[PDB]
């Protein structure tokens, strides 16, 4: 898993 990706945006 990897959430810490998608959610990222600056």
């Known amino acids: 898993r990897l959430k810490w ?4 945006r600056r």
Do not use: D, E, P, T
Request: glycine share 0%.
């Open 5 to 8: 990706v998608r959610i990222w």
